[PDB]
Structures are given as structure tokens and as C-alpha cells.
Symmetry: D2
Subunit: 472 residues, 4 copies
């Protein structure tokens, strides 16, 4: 059972909008909205969305596997060895938010302070002492962006696995000599940095010039979660506020995906007339170029929705019914909808590029979708005894060395329940960078934004106050 | 009673090093070390220090007042009006960490997300609705450093007050016409931005070319806290590890100040031979140029300690007894002391420029000195009933509008106990940016680093684990 | 008769290598090498070449017309109006080296100091006084690269004409309102800057992703000058030194073009065995990325010449027979051929990107190919009486207002002999920027590098010494 | 006889303004204005000036020697060795426009293309072959400003000599070991780069914080050329146009110097009332910060001429009688005087920072003062036979190896007539970079701007047309 299997199982259920049923349903962790900062829903006047992995949640592992395959095929087409074609995507390896170290060719899982939690070279998981040779302080300076690339999006899952596959392959292939910073093949030297750039380039190519979009749209049921409750929630949002779409995707792809997401024989509820997807939005903006969108943005353009091409010129006119925008900036949205930042709840999956930037640059309210939570929550509850034992061991150690090997064992067994690179949110008792960023920049979070459907219009989401140590 | 009065009262006490007495003493909030991140003291092998406001804590309000007076005198000398000479420093106005908005000439107290907590134009404290005219989202983007300057050091206290004095003065002086972005004086327009730059320039001038250092050193008892327990603590640190000084100050000033701080008729304990200040350090580095120090730094130089001048050339030799370094980088320290970052506890007051940068760039352990805490803790405990009422009002409101005006009143009365700009750490129930940065980048904090004297050599400082909402 | 017609007529002649015949032949301006700086050919040890418009001179106006048509088709495909399809390339309009002013939508011909010589808005040539409205000092600051784009390559000829066509079209089309900085089409505003960027983008697209290369290679006789004397000259160069190719083009295109340029039933001379093009080069480097090539360059790669793809990795090996390089830097060439800059004569058409940069950054000797000279020289000699009258009028005026209108008339009539935008090298008696750059950065220049064939191996090219006014 | 002796001898002569006398006087090379670009004086409507080395020509070698001495004293005061005090300025060594190579510690004289003409390490003049070890192509890339500093101003003459003195001193002092990039003194390494920066810093210090200005103003007759013809020329300029001052110097220094330059018992002519210096200017601007002045400049301020301090605020008012400006930009001048660039003749000595930038950025007309020409012209005419022999040897060689050693000998003997680093304008038959920049950016040039006095109001300065080789 993948996280998208969980999401789709919940998607298949019709909405029981009885008030007691809703209250009962959102008690469950799976259908809950989690709160890092208090948020009064009555103050929200605009609800905004990203599309990819927010409205359109791609099914796992099928979509990652398609991405992986196409990226492999691209590398082979530019001259990588044929053996790459024997790789096959393995969803049990990558966890989101890993750091690729381009100097030494390692995948690293780090905490909020750059401390190493996990280090793998290819498929070899390096133990603490061997880690010190390359990381003397068990630390990386993560904003050294010339060296470190943080694999923070769900689109980065295939390349996370592919990087490890490639390091493994070159290491074990007798044609190459393993060196500290890459591989020697006679008079050719392939650094991990050059290899990483090739991978990054190929992933970008697959998305923008290759067949990934085409292959997705030709089998949307295979590749995209679909939920008849989506139009119900959007229609309810529109009763109390304005609704907007701001997506990096282009209009043609957006229209294909959104048309699919709304293709039911009814509109908001069973029995109601079907309505086009565009009718659910007060403002539709494509080619957003986030994160730049949250600063200067780009020139505001209008989409010719008949052709899918941009009209020639900058659009200087007002908001009108049926217009579709391209580019612009977050200020376009504010101006056209008559909103200030705190009137907006922006809903997305990209914890850096959208959620962090909308919060930091504009003071928008934020709702982070974390699709993996739909399954991570099942693991968390099913294996609560391991975490609780781990807590009790940390307690017992602190008030006091057979305990230390035991702390490692339980940490390992716990982490392995999630996958080879452990939980998105922690390794044993240590929180990841990703977890820290969620807590810091997402006001609200959940496995799906659909969980908003189970809270009433003016619900007050409450987080407990944070006190300093000297205040406690 | 100022915070430095509290510090000096505690400084005057001799050290009772009986183990029960120590344990009893550190129970008290005033003598406690507060813990944001767990830290095993046995793993610390090097203790490093800043000098100014860390080892050498300048007395308040006398030192701020001297700075203020000299800065005023400098502005008058460059052509500001004579009325400036009638200003007098008022310690009840400024709190550290305020933001000067150079566009509109306001001092702002903000939370970690840039939300406005307090806004004052001169001495006029602007209420919520009037604030919306200039700050439509009650928000600033604080890293817009062309517009906003954050007054984060204790050296910035005099200019914090001086900015408000100047805005008040120009506003109420009939020679000038108040405009949205500054003041018109016929065919001269003085923007708040130009005024701010003049103030900043004058403060820098007073420190580097004016008489502030000279006036400080001619009356050190007036201006600098002195504690006979300082050599005791440093001597104890040296029994278990290495001790270093890394200061932005120059050698001549450093030597004057440090000589004063160690000028007792004894060394570490009463009855012991006096030892020169330099003997307490394994490594002494001046002209550090932090924060650049924590990246590329500057060329490593050697001080001729006879003349106070730099020897000509880059120093390429080893660590030797009696050598004093100038410039260099944090890597110099690591190399020369044979330390990795996590072996180092760096002790300082500058929450951005030293503590944040040493943590983020190098993974050093950090101890933040917050001198104002020595008095803020007295206010916190004395007025606990106001905060607790505030908590109970927030609770009672949330589970449910005569309450809202009551929440404002109690918030105001609480804040005013600290001063006109409230607590360093909060306004009512909302934490400041400064508080958030302390929690994020200081492993340990206290009103004085002397509080380390009351914990045993291998003490384990414990912070409770942080759990995410869905983990709780 | 176009310049390429002149070049091809000379190309069709066999080489008479009798020493008297050669000396007689190079007397003629058409077959001469012109000298700005003295150059001792015996000191040249390496001869280097660019390919496009140097070895492979594209026929005019056919190649410009193909580029124009494809660029038009691309703009229409992205949403420009259908009327664009009625444009047809006109070789009588553009001269190379014009400046497009993106603010006001003008093509400008300027002197070396930025003084306006000619200003056209669409097809309207603006007279002196009307020019002052937009250019009050009849001057532009040409390195304001955000505003001005200098159209310096022969590849820029189609877009030079297309820009004027588009300004004309939008100006005269009643759907649009002409504004100072662009065109209003209801609620769309198309600035000249956005229009220019679209044109630039489309030209780049045609070259790199469109059908221009394909259409060229399918009819090389239509599109490329071919000269059986090319292998003779290259073979002679190889007798006295090393020969290299450094081209921005890719290997596959390079191989197609070069194979065509050497496709005769003989090698260097009639009767000799044909030899592959690669055999004429000691070093072949593609994907050069000039001008960056003359600084840091890019990573040195090796071409797999069987597939046309790059081998994976940086190439660390030596120069070997048959190897083809990609990327690298000018230092690669120097190192591998054992040359210093002054031992190299670099032969190319790109007066900025190759000739200026190789001279300024590396001190290479330079030979500039100026294909238009093959026809400009015919105009220069045929209309010498107009220029001489112009000289006599400037003389007679200076030693002294019916003369001023006469100076304008003769200037106009002279310029119009070259085309609507006049000579590449001057307007009347005023030299262009392009002329000044030729004099400054090209040691030698000619209509074709083939003219080197007519000078003996160790010829000394002589330029007269330049004296200052006070030295004269 | 120094160049300033020549200037002062001519300064002591009264103006004979008879038209025949003037025409006869300007025939002589010493009193001539030299012409690189034709310039119609009747079109000039504004005459602008720099002060230092333009209006105020400092006497040589006395002023260089004072600068040298004070710079030496500053270096000793910061810890350089006492032996520096035994140096004494030698005007026979430095020529203006040399390049200091901070890598290898050489002074280089280069041509316009970066080719080495002269290379000295300390006082050792390195011959051609030994030069190739460090400069394999006898070439430097002069805009590598991290490595090369071009000593282009007359203020740089003392440091030119001091750099050579220091390299000599350290080389020959047995305490130091000479290395390729600097000097080793035990565990101190002084690179030529660090040494150069110290020198540069010290020169700046002497000018801005040391006693150079004070020592100059206390003996103006010793240090500054004074010419009673100065007010006559400025008064004549004011009859036909506007006159402005734009100087980097501050008001107080400007007022001292200018007051001295106008301190005669008469005004424009003998017998006329004395008038204050300010009365000769329509616009006076100090603290100009050229070259930035010719781009964005700085904020426009007004000087309080009673105090010498700036008024507080940006000056927004009009041009009024008696106002003195500070900062601003070249656009301030244009706006306030109602001038376009070509209406302005800007008169200065700084061939980069003023003349080049005013021409390139604004299209101003330019008059370059070259004080050394007042003596270089005497050498040029007195030793014409050496140059002519050199020309005849170059001719005879070219149409054809006892000649090559002869070309070196005559080149050496010629150059040595000017000084150890030869003529400002050439080494033998090769022009310097400085010469090329004069020809390129100065419309007019002369040893003094006073030479304008000898040409009538609407004189037409003529330069011959430049033809390309193929046009000739």
C-alpha cells in the first residue's frame, strides 16, 4: 500500500456532510488538518492552489517509475552505457528531502542544523566512523549550493534513486576506477558533479521536451488520483471567498489535467450539473515561474485559450470572466482579488519554492500538502511501540553503554519500517530538515487539502503557544 | 535597577564551590543556564569567547548614554541642528531588536514572520488601524535590507533611541514640513533613509575614530562590569579543554579591557598569584572581522604585542606560546587547536553575527549571553500574574469581544513593565523575532556565561524533544 | 551581383601558383590582404579557423532569405499575425552593425563614439532635427546593453530587416495604436523591447531547434560557397605550421559542411588523391562557446565521431591523431599545440566575439574575414569620384552654406550605392563603429582568407606607423 | 628643467592679445593645442574644469617628493622597516602609466595591446629573453584588475617610484628571502600583492587623513603653478559661454587652492579690479566622485560655504547665484546649464576617470591636459635626429641583423633622454597604452589648457580624416 493508494481509497468515498459525521471523520489522523500556527478560517478570503502534487496527485510508484524510465532512456540516448536500461525504479529506496553531495557522490539525510543522520554511497550505508573521513564534523553547510543539491520535491524521487543506482553501477563496473570525486575511464574522468548535472539536465529534459507529459495524459487513470469530493470542496470555498490557481505548468497541460480531475457525470455533488473546471476559479494563472513569482515575477500575459498560445503583448486590462493569465507576480493576485496576504490561504506541496517563499516574502497563510503522510501516518501509529521504547531509552540513558547499541538497533528497525532512507520527518528521535521546515513555514498541513472539507466554514485551528526555556 | 546592576551585584559575590551550594545556586533563574538543544559538556574540548558584551559587559545606562552623547555631538559637528544637544538618553525607551523602516521613519517590533507587534513614529505609538495605511498586511519583508535595518546589538541601543528622538524633533520643529518619506526644509529634503545613514555613520565614527574607546578606558569602573569569578571559571575551563578569544576588537583596546577584567590582587582564587590575562588563553585572535570570519575570513596576521601594530606579512608559522593573531578565519582556530566544530562551545552576545553564523556555517556549539535577561527575569517572575491572566484570556476567547479589549489592556500593562518597547522576547503572548532566533541558534543561553561555573565539568544540559503535530 | 557572387566567381578560378602570377593577382584590391598592424608571417606557427562565414561562407541573399522566412514562420507559429507571411527578405535594406534601440524601436548606424549617422523607424529614415526629440545629443551610450543591441554578425542580417518590417507593419496596421515605446492593441501592450526579444528568441530557435541547418545541408550548392583552392591553402599552411579548427558549431553540422567544402575529385591540387577534411587539421575543436572560450572556457570533452555524441567525462589525455575535442578553452589549443598567442593567426568573421576577444584576452594575431568587402570594394572603386568630391567639399568648407546641403546630397547619393543603410564602413566621410573595430582589433583583413594564398610563406605585411599630432 | 618649470616660465609671461602675436605664439609646439578630432569652438557653449593637475598644476618634483615622503612615513608608522626613511624621491625613474604586476612585483610599460615594452623588477631592467619566463607571450591582459594596477595619474608618480624602491630594498636586504611572488621573513610572508595594497592604502591615507593637504596649503608658491593669464582665459570663456567646475576635491581645499590661483592685485587683466574665484563660474560642484559622476552619481547636496560643511538634505532647488553644489551627476550639470553633451568642452588631466568616461558615457567634448608634455616636447624636438634614424632603420630593415642590435641601441638611447622608464607616449617606435588612450578619447590636448587663450573664439580645430587600408 503506497501513499497514493491511501489517498485514492479515501477519494473513492462520497462526502457525508452531516455535521456529526464530519466531526467524527476528522478525529482520525488520516483525515485531519494538522496545525503549526493558529489560523482563524473566517479571516481567509481567498483560497489559492498549485496544481502538480496538490490538485493533481500523481500515483505512486507508477509516476515515479515512468519518470525514472524516461530519464534513464534520455541518459542512454546521450551516451551513457547500455547497462542503465537494466535499472528498475524501487520505491523502497528514496525518501524525499535528501541531499546529494556532488563532491563525494553521497546521498545524505540531515537534520535542521546540517548534522548527518544517514549517509549512503550508492547502496552502501556508511556507518558513523567511516563517515568522519569525508565529514570530519558529521556536518554539511547546506547552503553551499555549488556542492549540495537538496532533493525536496516529489518530482525529485526518481533522480534520488537514479543517483544511487549510477554511483553503484560505476563503482562495481570493472571498466571504471573509483576515485574520491568520481570515476576514471581511461582518459575520461567523470566527476560526481558532472554526473549529477547530467541527471538533473535529463530530468528537466523529460519534463519539458520529452514524452513524460504525453505519456501521463494518455493514461490519466493510471497516473493521477481523482476524487469526486474535489469539486464539492472548491464549490464550498467559493461560497465564502475567492478561489485561484497559480501553477508553474502551461495552459495546455493544465487544461488536460484539470479537465480530468473534474470529469464526473455531475458537478459539486452527485445529481448536480457538471460545470467546467475553469468555473471553480475566480482567477487562473499559469506559467507562474514560482519562486520568482513571489518577488518581481515576470510580465503579465494573457492566454488565448482557443490555441493555448500567449496573446502578443503585456496584459494591462482588468480581471474579467473567462480570462486566463500567464506569468505575473503574487502582487497580480493581490491586486486583482483585492486581497492582502493574510487574507490568503495558499495550498501547495512545494515546501521551499511555494510555501516558504509565499510566507517569507508576502506573509500569506500556508497549507502544505504532504502526500507521503497518507502512508507515513499508518506506519507512525502501527509502530508507535518502537518510538515509545526509543523515547524511554533516551530518558533512561540521560539520567545515568549496552543502552547505546540498543538505541542504534531500535532506531534502525524503526527507520526501516518507512524505507531504506527512513521517515520523511525523522531518523529515530532526530527530526529532519524537512520536518523543521514544515513546522516553520506551513501554518497547516495534511496528507491532502481535501481534509479541509471536514471542518466548518469558520473553524479556528489552534496551535499551543511556544514558551522559551526561561519562561517555562 | 538595570540589568548591569543585577550582573554587578552577582559579580561582587565570591564563589562558594561546595557542590551542594552550587546545585542550590543554579536552581535560581538568575544563575541558571537555559537549554534549547541538548549539550553534553564532556564533549566540549574548546571554549571560545567574544570580548565586547560577553567578557566585557558595559554598564547600563551609563555606557549607552556615553555612546548617545558622542553620536549626538558628531551629528551636530557635521551640521545637524543645535537642538540635538538638548536630547538626553532614556533607557526606558529602546528595547533591542527593533527594525528601523527607512521608508516611513518608524521603529517596528516584529515577530519571527515579520508581523507588526509595535510601531512607533518618533514617540507616537501607532494603533492597529492607523498602521494599515503604511503596512496594509501588518507585515514587513525583513530581508529587504535596502529598506529595513534590524537593530540587533547592544551597541545599537543608543541609535535606537536617537532615531526616535530625531523623528520627533523634525516632526515638531516648525522649520520643517513633515512628508511621508522625510522632511522638507525649503529646498532641502531630508529623507528618513538619509537621516538613518547619517546616524549609522556617526555611531561607526564614534567607535572607530571618535573618543568612545578613550572615554571608556579612562573610567573602566564606571563603564565595565568586573567579576573576580571570571578567572576562576576560565581556569576551570582550561583544566578540561582549550580556551580561545576571537574578537572583532583591536589588540590595544582588547589589552586595556582584558587587563582591567583580570586586575585583582589574586589569580583564579583569592590567595593565588595574579597571572596576566593572556595566560588564560591557548589562542588569542583579534581583528576577527566576524561574520566574514566564519567563511573566507581574511589573511592571518601576527600582532607585535610590544607596539600593538601588525607584523608585516601573512603569518605562516605554528601556534606558539605568547603569539597573538589578527584576522584569519574560523578554520584557523580549528586547525591550530585540533578541533572540529562540535568540540567547540562559542560564547557570545551577537545572536546574528556570531552565534547564528558559527552554528549555520560551521556547526559550532553556541552559548548566547543576553545581558538584559539579568533584569528581564526579575520582571518575568514579579509580573507572572499578568502573563498567566493573559494565557487564561487567550484560552477563554479561543473556546467561544469585551475579552478582546481586555486582552489589549493586559498586553499593554504587561509590556510597559519592561519599557516603552516592551520585552526583548515578546509583546504580550506573541514572541519576537529575537526570541525565535535565540531558540533556533543558541544551544544554551543565560544572562551571563559566568553561570557555567555552577555546573559540574561533565554536566549534560537537556532540552525536551520537539514533536510534530501529527506525532503528538 | 552580391558579395557571395563575387566570392564564388573568384572561387571558380584554379590556382596559378607561378610567382609572378601571384604577385600580379594580389595587386588587385579584390585579392589583397589589408594590413592594420605589421605581421611577419614567418613568426606564425599555427593557423586557426572559425567555420561559419569563414570557411563556410553562406551565399547571399539566399541564406539570409531562408533565415528570414524560417524566423517569420516561427513568430507566426507562436501567435504573431498572419500578415508577417507576406514579408519577403530584401537584401537592399540591412547593412551589418546596426544598433537596435529597444526603447524607441529604431535602427541606428553609429560612429565609434556613439554619434548617430542614420536613424530609421521601420522604413522611415528620420532627418537630423526630428532625431533630436529622442536623441537630444545625437548620441547613444552603446554599452547600455539593457537598451541597445548591436547587430554585428552576418547571422543578424535577417533580423535587422525583420525588425524594420515589424515596426513598419505595426505602425501602419489600424488594429494597433502607435505609442512612444511600442504598440497598444486594446488591453495588450507590445513594447519594442518585448518585440525585439521575441525576434531574438525566434532567430535562436531557428538555428538550434528549427529547420535551418536541415534545409541548408539538403542544398549545399545553393547555400554555401565552395572553392577548390581551399584545400591548397590549408595544405600549404600545414607545410609551415599547425592548423586548427575552433568552431561554435556542433560536430554533426561541422562534419556535413566541411565534407561538402572538401568534396572535389582531388585533394590539395587537381590530380592529387582526395583526403578527408579532418586530415587538414592538427586539432579540431567543436562546441567552442566563444567568447567564453577565451576566458575560463568549459570542460574539455571528446567527441565520439562515429555517433556524433560526446563521450561521458572530461578528457584528460594528450593530443592524438583522429581525436575531436568539444568545449575547452583557448589555453587547450595553446597547450596542445605548444604555442604562445603571438605564434597564432586566428581567422574569423566575428569581429567582437572572436577577433576582439582573442586579441584582447590572449594576444593572438588576427585575420578578419569580411565577406561584404568582396562587393563593397567594387562600389568603392566604381564610385571613387563621389567620395573624392566629398573630400574636396569638406576641405573647401573647412577653409572658409550652399556647400552644406551639397555635402548632404553627395553623402546620400554615395551611401545609397551601397544600400539603404549605406556602407558597412562609413556614412559619407564618417567612419562607422564597425570600421573602427576592424582597424583596432584585426591585424589583417580581407574579403576572404583565401587571399593568403597569393602571398609567399614568409611575407612581411606592413602597416605605416601611427604618430601623435604633437609628433607629426 | 622639469615640466612644471616650463609651465611656470610660460605662466610668468603677460598675455599679448594682439591678433598677430597670438597667431605667431600658437605656431610654437609649446603653446599649441593638438587635435585628434575636429572641433568647432563656436559650437561649444559650456567650458568645464577639473581642479587638481588641471587648474592647480602641482610643481615637480617638489610635490611628488612631498607625497613620497609622507607615504614612506606612513608605512614606517604602521610597521615597515626603518630603512624606508633613507629612500629619497627620484624624478628620473617613474614615467606615468606604468602597470604594477602584483603577482611578480614588476613595473611594466605596455603598448595598447598589452605587449611588454619595458619590464623592471625593483631597479633591474629585465631583457627580452628573461622576460619570457614570467610573460611567455610578452603580454599581459591589462583588465585583469585583480592582478594589474595601472598607475595613470600624476598622483601615482610617488607610488610608482616607491614600489620599485620597496622591491629593491626587500630583494637586497639579507633578513628576507626572495620568492617568486614576494618575500619570506621567517614565519611571515609578504606577497607583492599585500605590499602593493599597503602602498595604495598609505597614499590614500596621506591624501585623505594625513598632512599632505595641510603641507601643500602652507606653502602654495612652492607647490602650485600660478598664472595671471588664468583669469583672463576664464573671463573670455564666460563672454561666449558658461563656465563650470566639477572636482573630486572638497570645498575647503578647493577654496584654498582656487583663492591662491586668483590671488593677484588685479582681475582678468592688469589694471582691472580683483574678483573672487567663485565669480568666474556659473556652476561650482565639489565632491564630484568621478567617474561614478558620469553614471548614477550621488545625491545632490549644497555646501554651506561659511562653514565648509554640507547642508542637511538633498538639494531640490534651482541654480542660483552663489550656491555651491556637492555630489550630483553629469546630468546635474546638463540640466542646470541647459546643455547637451556636445555643447560641453570638459578640461582635465585624468585620461581614464574623466576624459574617457565623459566621452564614452555622455558624449562630452574633451580637452586633455598633459603636464609632462611641457618638457617631453623639448626632448622630442631636441632629439628628433634619434627618432628619425630609428624610422630610417625600421624602413631599411623591413625592405630586406647588425640592424637589429642597432635598433635596440638607438631605442635605448632615445628612451633614456626622457628618463629610466622612457617617454610617456612611446618606447622607441612603439606607442604606449597611454598614447593610444589620448588619441582615442581626447578631442584636443596640450601641456596646459591655457593654450586655448591663443586661438580665437570660433576657431575650427581640424584633424585629418582616418581612412581604412582598403580605402587608401
Amino acid at each position: 500500500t503506497s501513499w497514493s493508494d491511501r489517498l485514492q481509497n479515501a477519494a473513492d468515498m462520497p462526502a457525508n456532510m452531516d455535521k456529526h459525521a464530519l466531526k467524527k471523520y476528522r478525529r482520525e489522523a488520516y483525515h485531519r488538518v494538522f496545525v503549526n500556527q493558529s489560523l482563524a478560517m473566517e479571516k481567509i478570503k481567498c483560497f489559492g492552489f498549485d496544481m502538480d502534487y496538490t490538485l493533481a496527485v500523481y500515483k505512486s510508484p507508477e509516476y515515479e517509475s515512468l519518470g525514472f524510465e524516461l530519464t534513464v532512456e534520455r541518459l542512454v540516448s546521450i551516451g551513457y552505457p547500455q547497462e542503465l536500461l537494466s535499472f528498475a525504479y524501487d520505491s523502497t529506496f528514496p525518501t524525499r528531502g535528501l541531499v546529494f553531495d556532488t563532491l563525494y557522490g553521497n546521498l545524505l539525510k540531515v537534520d535542521a542544523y546540517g548534522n548527518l543522520l544517514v549517509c549512503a554511497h550508492g547502496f552502501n550505508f556508511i556507518r558513523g566512523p567511516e563517515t568522519r573521513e569525508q565529514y570530519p564534523n558529521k556536518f554539511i553547510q547546506r547552503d553551499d549550493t555549488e556542492r549540495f543539491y537538496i532533493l525536496n520535491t516529489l518530482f525529485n524521487l526518481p533522480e534520488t534513486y537514479l543517483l544511487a543506482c549510477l554511483v553503484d553501477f560505476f563503482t562495481n563496473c570493472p571498466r571504471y576506477t573509483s576515485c574520491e570525486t568520481g570515476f576514471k575511464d581511461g582518459d575520461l574522468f567523470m566527476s560526481y558533479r558532472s554526473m549529477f548535472q547530467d541527471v538533473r539536465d535529463a530530468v528537466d529534459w523529460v519534463h519539458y521536451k520529452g514524452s513524460l507529459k504525453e505519456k501521463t495524459v494518455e493514461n490519466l487513470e493510471k497516473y493521477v488520483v481523482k476524487d469526486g469530493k474535489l469539486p464539492l470542496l472548491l464549490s464550498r470555498m467559493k461560497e465564502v471567498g475567492k478561489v485561484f490557481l497559480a501553477t508553474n505548468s502551461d495552459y495546455k497541460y493544465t487544461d488536460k489535467i484539470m479537465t480530468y480531475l473534474f470529469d464526473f457525470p455531475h458537478g459539486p455533488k452527485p445529481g448536480s450539473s457538471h460545470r467546467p473546471w475553469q468555473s471553480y476559479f475566480d482567477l487562473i494563472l499559469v506559467d507562474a515561474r514560482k519562486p520568482l513569482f513571489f518577488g518581481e515575477g515576470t510580465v503579465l500575459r494573457q492566454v488565448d485559450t482557443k490555441t493555448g498560445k500567449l496573446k502578443i503583448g503585456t496584459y494591462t486590462g482588468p480581471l474579467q470572466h473567462g480570462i486566463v493569465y500567464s506569468g505575473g507576480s503574487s502582487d497580480t493576485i493581490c491586486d486583482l482579488l483585492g486581497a492582502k496576504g493574510k487574507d490568503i490561504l495558499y495550498i501547495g506541496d512545494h515546501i521551499f519554492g511555494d510555501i516558504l517563499k509565499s510566507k517569507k516574502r508576502q506573509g500569506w497563510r500556508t497549507f502544505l500538502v504532504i502526500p507521503e503522510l497518507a502512508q507515513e501516518l499508518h506506519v507512525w501509529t502501527d509502530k508507535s511501540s518502537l518510538f515509545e521504547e526509543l523515547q524511554s531509552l533516551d530518558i533512561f540513558l540521560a539520567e545515568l553503554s549496552s543502552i547505546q547499541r540498543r538505541i542504534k538497533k531500535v532506531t534502525h528497525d524503526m527507520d526501516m519500517c518507512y524505507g531504506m532512507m527512513g521517515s520523511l520527518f525523522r531518523s529515530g528521535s532526530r527530526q529532519t530538515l524537512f520536518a523543521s521546515q514544515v513546522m516553520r513555514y506551513a501554518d497547516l498541513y495534511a496528507a491532502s487539502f481535501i481534509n479541509l472539507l471536514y471542518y466548518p466554514f469558520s473553524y479556528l485551528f489552534r496551535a499551543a503557544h511556544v514558551l522559551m526555556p526561561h519562561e517555562s
